[PDB]
């Protein structure tokens, strides 16, 4: 019926690893690119996963490139995928730590090995380490709480600021419990600057106020000068890159025993 | 703590007087700065240390390939029919799933290097800028940052792409032994097939514990300063090291298929999947229409590799020191096997005759 | 020891603890005879 | 299950090898092997 | 005035089949259409060990005997084929009486078929493809044959450390004397002789039919050297005597894999096969080990057609050769023959000369100037792809040299300190505090 | 020969866009009698709905259905109706809102006062889920929420509307024309004292499709609350708000249709808007300021 | 209505059909979006042929366009199907941006480098196709009009235009266009007030943590941005979330601002670089 | 001769290395296929 | 200039200019590429480097 | 396909002339004296043609003393004089 | 085509001191001898 993408088994899938992919019949896939035929090795999020020095947001930044694809049926030898149509339902597989419950957006997210180090049919290095498709508000919230601590990673010889990371990694959503730099840069960056450049344009726009909001926005070289404008906005888009999550799902209803539910696709 | 070390004065109480250990002392109090090795070979006065500049080629070349009578049966299906609809030109993709069931006992085909067709590299004198390499790396220091990224790295190719990488050495090295005969450019050779089909801390001990002596020399270590785990060759040459550290992963590196600790840890399982693993992960190629030399992105062929991941040693070319010793190779029409040395000189003779072969072919 | 030309390395029986020191080699001649020879020393110096 | 080969019939074939058979499973010329030197009491226990 | 559009010359395609080809005497093609619902495929194979002992005293081993699986890989393959919703269009809507239903239903059929049949044609030469890339991904290369031919012939069990140190002086020795060997100038007798070693040092599978792949005269083949364009014709153009164009026999279709009555309710019960059941349950209800006449992969009732095929002799085998650029000419992937093998160069530079056993052979053609320049071995030269002189230095390996990579100690303190020392007494001793 | 004549066949499927739907519903309504839900490119979901949740919505249909995040863990999900929320909204007429508060009201809504206006609304417990069609009164409500498409009867026979109330529309009511309009919706808060305000909720319609030039004409409309949203960025310092305003598409309707009406229920009727086509279309949150 | 059959109503030529026969599945925007519509409509140019004519009004205004696709080009009649929501089309390249697979395109009122014929100027008519760029080029043209706009607000009246001339020369993949002589107009005024105030809430919401954290990594860490960015304690993490969030309240509006709609998702580019399947209108 | 050796095996636009070994191949094959009357001869090299 | 060395440029044959202009390993159509070439000596040089 | 394009029919009326023939890669090739079809003419003929060839070589150009050496020393020995020391001149046969 | 030079009269007789080859480019110190690229001095002495 819809789009198709064929996943050939590099390695050999025992009758029990089908076992276990016939079970996640309706779980999503993270694909690198769209195209007919792909390598179990380029199925899945494992080639992402993977650096000595790979920061979260880096990772984001590539799962952001990946097309999320829907498993279709495993069929032996191969795996049937679905790049899924924009708009219609779709039976995902709650493979995350958090029971969704009906009307939520669902976001895709990297899964952390903060306490809930996790992998799959695993042969030959190869897992299908399989991202969490995590309600939106709280997808904005893990990654809030990833900048702060990495904010704070900094002081730790204040164990004072040590005891405000240790409440800080502490993530506790709906029925479920779970523990957690150039972006903190980028976050500094905006910080100090526009501190410090605002203020030669608050008092000169603050004389005409249409909205009527200028007057109380006074209450709160040239080439360096769009030197610091341009390394503002370019790091401003440098954060907006990562955090706009772009929303994946909106599950409609929840299947008892909270393994599938059936998910309106969006975005 | 001291500014002067050990050997200022250990040599000093050996040494020859009158006018040479006076002004040698003071030669002796160069710095080792990154900028004072800057401006010493900018000035063209040798810095304390020696270099080995390390150097991939590629060759396009004819590869014939026998295979036996039935050998592999090539089971298949019939070709199925799948179709995507891009809403004004619509794709039928169509597939034919097949598994390859192996062939007898043994190997029913072989690969031969045949004929060189290309050679892709231009065996250019090019070198591999770590500015560009680790782009994060710069001085505490915003002038002295300026200085050296002005100092050097702030559309154009005649011989195909460039091809470079780098290791740094003691001076003292046998160029008389080590570099005649092919070898690992760490210094020690680290062969697989020297160590035992399985034994991982046997093959640690191949290649960091100096204590065991080297194979295939018994000198334990030529480089020390590029053998060791965490040597200089190591932090910078490994790919787990420089992956701890932040690099480019684009860039090819000759140095890897040595200095990675892990990826010759792996070619450490049983001497006939250490060929099937040869044949399988030969997929560290170089991207065909890139000016420089950046690897492969998805592929698209096992090309055969060098000896490298499976014999350890890198080829020797034919190598001058002074064009005096080189003009007296290639006086006239002759070969560029001669070895001769004048007295601080060297000619290190190629080992594959390729500056004779590409010439005849 | 020798795994770094430039830096120098050793360890240091402190209290309880043998601790490294990666202490930089400041001029050239900091490296031993055994690396940097006498003959090597003097040819440099007629160099400069 | 290697019963399943030595207890069942099979097809009388021309082989071939590189070395040698007993070094094609320590030198791995195959990897899930079965060796064995005695006439194994396994495939008559079934 | 005038343009003169003369004939347009439309080039028709040139054809292809993989049993035509010479590659398929050594494939084996099978259809089976639950290969989408195997695992994968795992051939046993008994092997009763050639047995001997012997003498007085001599360690004699018991009755070894050998039982090995052998598995199958994937390779399975995807081309598209695009047609323009814009030329399905008329052949939905098919005007009446139109210049677009007298001509442009029929090419919009004409490009239907066009897509068809180049997509047979890709289906083809992307088997041909498929197998090429399996034989090359499963082949070593021939250096390394030789050698495990040669060295590792009388050693039993696993290797010996001395006996794998002599397997790697037999690779460097055989790659360095057999590398880029029709690129070296060989004799007509001494490429026949190492065709003799190729083919000989090469082992002859387990699949063997006197039907097909012979030459008339009963004369049957042993497989096939494929290669590319100058190697196949510098081939023929030395052993043009011995190489003689013959029609040979081959199968002009597939071979089927069935799932029997029984077997499917096996795959079900246990998911697996075994092949020829009803040929081992005739065993059974029998006396049971009497070997099977007719295997799954042996009884094919395979049609025949004949190609025309360069054959030759050497090791006293027959054998074809392929020029697989017929069936690449003019697709966009390069042949996997044609390769690319990069080789790693070292050399040293400022590498200074110990001084006190120095010498100077070849003094007789070199007179350099006494300058330390020249005393301190501080440049090199060398050629390049063509022989052009290329010097390098310090001065031009300044960007390595000067990078903060270098003059970090990091990780090299994170190596040194986890790296404790070595339990030598001297450095027990010189375990100490003074800075 | 073999590979060509078999492609003819996967080729020459035309006219449809995959004919895989159309053709292989028709072989299992030939096989089960005529097959509701079929012929429905619009999509749908059934939900539990409680009794004290049942009503309104059922009397009248075609009206939205919202999500909590309510703070209580055992009933954490609660119906929403657009109807409901008016009831939290500073737009909303007293009378208004004591209108549809006492529909609600009797005996198994009142939490739901304290648990919106006292849990106050970060509008991230709320969640667009969609419009309803045919209300299943029994042992307990089971309504057929739609989510991309229109709502509609079964058997394609009316086009159920969307059922907006007044006071929450004409405050952001968009500009006259006959063309195509989309609804938006806007939650906006006025930072003045209560940490979050009396958060107002808004369905705006708009011909503009575009998101900062949408904004924009809210920076026309919410300069009452943005000042004061510049407010208590300095009346407190260390305490922050959030958000001033958030917009999010919810569907669009073709605009000739808009109209009034009104609906007949208990504790008095209730003026609505009446929005006749309104193909649900649920989009992304745009948080802004 | 999603097909729209367009009336040409201009006097063309067989050299105009035939270059939009090799262009089918090119992007024309229309206003009115009927199933029948003329030329004078179908297409982008009747609008950037205005006397003002400056980038201000042209992004703010096509805004209000609805894309088309170009489909069955014979003659006289041009199908163009309206692109729904979420489907995979195919798009012929009209800018040269190479559009870097697996990203979000966007629109570009026209490239301003001259009038380009976008057709043929048929009857003093051509018809001029928008610029479909992959966001970072269409958020990067947008930065630096607000960048030479709040330049010109303390300038006199040369500083801007040494300060514009450097930065008005966008090398781009594949591309070096020009900023259109930045004029100085209120739609800008409007947005460049607001984005001046959400500089000044960032500066509110710093809680002296996100402040200071380059100013702490100086003296511990040497890196590339680190060095840069030179030239250019509490319990309450709880409160911090909320600041924090609040800022991103502001970073993910001000952005807004500068960035535009997103528009066609690359699904897969073809190797000739010029037929590229995007999904998400 | 470089064009049948190497040119027509790719179909695109020519690679910045590939067109750089043509122009070596040009220099090889015209330094060794200048004159060849002139240069040494054999028959078999004549006709091949 | 008197220093040019005989052994860098002038025993293989090389153009005259100094820098290799040839126009076949170049970006072919590309004027600036070609300008880069021959004129820019930031950029490097062909068949020398 | 048009069986009968109009370059593919231009029907011919034979004749033989004795000519030469190679057997070359199997594909055989014909001969001509083009030379007795411009016997005695003004116009030459242009398989004969004129082909200039460009060549560089440097006069004057020093040599770095600290690298420099001399080999071919046991075919050389010259006076001591700077004249030979510095290049000044370059010697270079003719075309005889 | 770097033809065949000699920069001395001594390097020329180097060369063509009688039947002998040309290219040979053999420096002395400020002396040097050019290789021809074509051996025309051969092809024109033969032909």
């Given at each position: ?76 030898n191969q795996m049937i995928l679905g790049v899924p149509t924009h708009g219609q339902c779709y039976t995902i597989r709650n493979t995350g730590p958090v029971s969704w419950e009906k009307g939520d957006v669902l976001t895709t997210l ?158 | ?361 | ?48 | ?46 | ?113 066009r897509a068809v049949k180049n997509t047979a044609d890709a289906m083809e030469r992307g088997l041909i493809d498929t197998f090429l890339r399996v034989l090359l991904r499963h082949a070593p290369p021939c250096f390394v044959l030789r ?289 | ?289």
């Amino acid at each position: 019926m819809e789009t198709t993408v064929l996943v050939t088994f590099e390695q050999r899938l025992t009758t029990g690893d089908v076992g276990k992919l016939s079970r996640l019949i309706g779980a999503v896939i993270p694909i690198p690119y769209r195209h007919h035929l792909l390598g179990s090795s380029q199925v899945g999020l494992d080639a992402v996963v993977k650096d000595k020095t790979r920061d979260y947001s880096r990772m984001r930044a590539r799962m952001r490139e990946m097309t999320l694809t829907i498993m279709r049926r495993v069929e032996g030898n191969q795996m049937i995928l679905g790049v899924p149509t924009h708009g219609q339902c779709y039976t995902i597989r709650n493979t995350g730590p958090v029971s969704w419950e009906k009307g939520d957006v669902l976001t895709t997210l990297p899964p952390v090995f903060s306490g809930e180090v996790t992998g799959l049919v695993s042969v030959s290095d190869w897992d299908l380490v399989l991202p969490w498709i995590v309600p939106m508000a709280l997808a904005t919230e893990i990654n809030q709480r990833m900048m702060m601590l990495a904010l704070l990673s900094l002081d730790r010889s204040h164990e004072e600021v040590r005891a405000a990371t240790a409440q800080l990694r502490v993530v506790r959503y709906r029925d479920a419990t779970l523990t957690l730099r150039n972006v903190c840069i980028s976050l500094s960056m905006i910080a100090n600057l526009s501190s410090e450049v605002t203020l030669a344009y608050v008092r000169k726009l603050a004389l005409e106020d249409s909205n009527m909001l200028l007057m109380k926005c006074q209450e709160i070289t040239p080439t360096e000068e769009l030197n610091k404008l341009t390394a503002l906005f370019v790091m401003i888009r440098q954060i907006t890159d990562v955090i706009s999550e772009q929303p994946a799902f909106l599950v409609c209803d929840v299947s008892p025993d909270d393994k599938s539910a059936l998910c309106i696709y969006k975005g | 703590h001291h500014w002067h070390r050990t050997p200022f004065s250990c040599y000093s109480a050996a040494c020859a007087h009158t006018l040479e250990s006076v002004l040698t002392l003071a030669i002796m109090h160069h710095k080792m700065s990154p900028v004072s090795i800057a401006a010493l070979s900018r000035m063209g006065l040798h810095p304390g240390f020696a270099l080995t500049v390390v150097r991939t080629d590629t060759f396009e070349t004819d590869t014939l390939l026998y295979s036996t009578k039935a050998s592999t049966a090539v089971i298949i299906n019939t070709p199925i029919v799948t179709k995507e609809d891009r809403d004004i030109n619509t794709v039928f993709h169509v597939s034919q799933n097949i598994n390859t069931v192996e062939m007898g006992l043994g190997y029913g085909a072989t690969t031969c290097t045949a004929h060189l067709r290309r050679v892709r590299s231009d065996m250019g004198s090019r070198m591999q800028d770590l500015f560009q390499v680790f782009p994060m790396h710069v001085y505490r220091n915003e002038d002295v940052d300026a200085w050296v990224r002005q100092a050097t790295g702030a559309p154009a190719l005649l011989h195909g792409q460039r091809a470079t990488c780098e290791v740094i050495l003691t001076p003292v090295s046998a160029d008389l032994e080590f570099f005649r005969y092919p070898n690992n450019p760490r210094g020690r050779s680290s062969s697989m097939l020297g160590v035992d089909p399985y034994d991982e801390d046997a093959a640690l001990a191949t290649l960091y514990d100096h204590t065991s002596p080297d194979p295939q020399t018994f000198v334990s270590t030529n480089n020390p300063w590029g053998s060791q785990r965490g040597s200089l060759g190591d932090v910078i040459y490994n790919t787990r090291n420089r992956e701890k550290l932040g690099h480019n992963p684009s860039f090819y590196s000759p140095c890897a298929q040595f200095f990675t600790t892990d990826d010759i840890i792996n070619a450490n399982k049983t001497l006939f999947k250490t060929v099937e693993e040869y044949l399988n992960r030969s997929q560290d190629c170089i991207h065909g229409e890139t000016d420089l030399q950046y690897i492969c992105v998805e592929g698209t062929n096992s090309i055969v590799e060098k000896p490298c991941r499976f014999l350890q040693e890198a080829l020797t070319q034919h190598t001058g020191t002074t064009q005096a010793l080189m003009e007296s190779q290639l006086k006239g029409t002759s070969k560029l096997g001669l070895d001769e040395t004048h007295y601080g000189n060297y000619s290190i003779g190629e080992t594959i005759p390729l500056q004779q072969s590409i010439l005849f072919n | 020891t020798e795994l770094h030309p430039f830096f120098d390395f050793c360890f240091h029986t402190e209290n309880g603890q043998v601790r490294p020191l990666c202490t930089p080699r400041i001029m050239v001649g900091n490296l031993p005879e055994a690396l940097a020879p006498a003959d090597f020393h003097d040819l440099r110096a007629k160099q400069a | 299950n290697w019963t399943a080969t030595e207890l069942l019939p099979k097809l009388d074939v021309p082989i071939d090898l590189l070395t040698h058979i007993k070094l094609s499973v320590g030198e791995e010329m195959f990897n899930n092997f079965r060796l064995y030197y005695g006439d194994d009491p396994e495939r008559y226990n079934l | 005035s005038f343009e003169a559009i003369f004939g347009t010359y439309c080039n028709k395609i040139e054809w292809v089949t993989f049993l035509g080809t010479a590659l398929a005497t050594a494939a084996h093609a099978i259809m089976f259409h639950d290969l989408n619902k195997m695992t994968t495929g795992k051939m046993l194979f008994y092997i009763q060990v050639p047995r001997v002992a012997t003498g007085a005293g001599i360690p004699t081993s018991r009755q070894t005997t050998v039982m090995v699986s052998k598995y199958s890989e994937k390779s399975p393959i995807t081309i598209p084929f695009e047609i323009s919703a814009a030329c399905l269009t008329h052949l939905k809507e098919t005007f009446e009486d139109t210049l677009l239903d007298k001509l442009l239903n029929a090419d919009a059929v004409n490009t239907v078929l066009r897509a068809v049949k180049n997509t047979a044609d890709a289906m083809e030469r992307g088997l041909i493809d498929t197998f090429l890339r399996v034989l090359l991904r499963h082949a070593p290369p021939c250096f390394v044959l030789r050698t495990l031919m040669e060295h590792g012939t009388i050693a039993r069990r696993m290797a010996t450390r001395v006996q794998r140190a002599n397997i790697a002086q037999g690779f460097k020795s055989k790659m360095l004397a057999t590398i880029f060997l029709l690129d070296r100038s060989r004799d007509r007798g001494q490429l026949t002789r190492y065709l003799d070693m190729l083919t000989d040092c090469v082992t002859e599978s387990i699949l063997d039919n006197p039907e097909t792949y012979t030459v008339g005269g009963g004369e049957r083949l042993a497989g096939v050297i494929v290669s590319t364009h100058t190697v196949v014709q510098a081939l023929l153009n030395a052993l043009g005597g011995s190489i003689r164009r013959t029609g040979v026999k081959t199968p002009a279709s597939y071979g089927k894999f069935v799932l029997s009555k029984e077997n499917a309710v096996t795959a079900i019960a246990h998911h697996a096969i075994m092949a020829d059941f009803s040929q081992h349950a005739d065993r059974i209800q029998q006396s049971s080990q009497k070997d099977l006449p007719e295997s799954q992969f042996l009884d094919q009732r395979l049609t025949f057609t004949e190609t025309q095929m360069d054959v030759l002799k050497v090791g006293e085998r027959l054998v074809a050769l392929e020029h697989l650029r017929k069936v690449y000419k003019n697709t966009d992937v390069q042949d996997p023959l044609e390769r690319d093998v990069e080789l790693t160069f070292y050399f040293p530079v400022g590498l200074h000369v110990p001084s006190g056993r120095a010498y100077s052979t070849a003094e007789n053609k070199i007179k350099l100037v006494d300058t330390a320049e020249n005393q301190l071995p501080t440049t090199v030269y060398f050629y390049n792809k063509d022989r052009i002189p290329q010097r390098i230095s310090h001065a031009e390996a300044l960007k390595t040299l000067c990078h903060p990579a270098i003059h970090d100690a990091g990780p090299c303190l994170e190596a040194f300190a986890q790296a404790g020392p070595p339990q030598g007494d001297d450095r027990v001793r010189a375990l100490c505090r003074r800075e | 020969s073999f590979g060509p004549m078999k492609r003819e066949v996967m080729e020459f499927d035309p006219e449809d866009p995959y004919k895989v739907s159309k053709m292989r519903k028709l072989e299992r309504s030939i096989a089960k009698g005529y097959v509701y839900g079929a012929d429905h490119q619009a999509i749908t979901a059934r939900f539990f709905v409680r009794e004290s949740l049942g009503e309104v919505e059922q009397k009248n249909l075609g009206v939205l259905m919202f999500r909590l995040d309510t703070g209580i863990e055992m009933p954490s999900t609660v119906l929403v109706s657009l109807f409901f929320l008016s009831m939290v909204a500073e737009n909303v007429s007293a009378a208004t809102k004591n209108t549809l508060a006492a529909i609600y009201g009797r005996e198994g809504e009142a939490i739901r006062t304290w648990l919106r206006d006292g849990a106050w609304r970060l509008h991230r417990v709320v969640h667009p889920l969609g419009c309803t069609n045919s209300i299943t009164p029994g042992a307990t409500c089971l309504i057929t929420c739609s989510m991309r498409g229109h709502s509609y009867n079964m058997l394609k026979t009316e086009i159920y509307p969307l059922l907006v109330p007044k006071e929450i529309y004409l405050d952001l009511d968009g500009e006259s024309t006959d063309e195509i309009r989309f609804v938006y919706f806007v939650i906006t808060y006025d930072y003045n004292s209560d940490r979050q305000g009396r958060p107002s909720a808004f369905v705006v319609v708009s011909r503009i499709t575009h998101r900062h030039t949408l904004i924009n004409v809210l920076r026309y409309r919410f300069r009452v609350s943005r000042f004061h949203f510049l407010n208590n960025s300095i009346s407190g310092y260390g305490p922050s708000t959030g958000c001033l305003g958030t917009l999010q598409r919810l569907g669009w309707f073709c605009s000739r249709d808009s109209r009034s009406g009104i609906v007949a229920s208990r504790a008095g009727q209730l003026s609505v808007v009446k929005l006749e086509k309104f193909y649900v279309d649920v989009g992304p949150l745009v948080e802004f300021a």
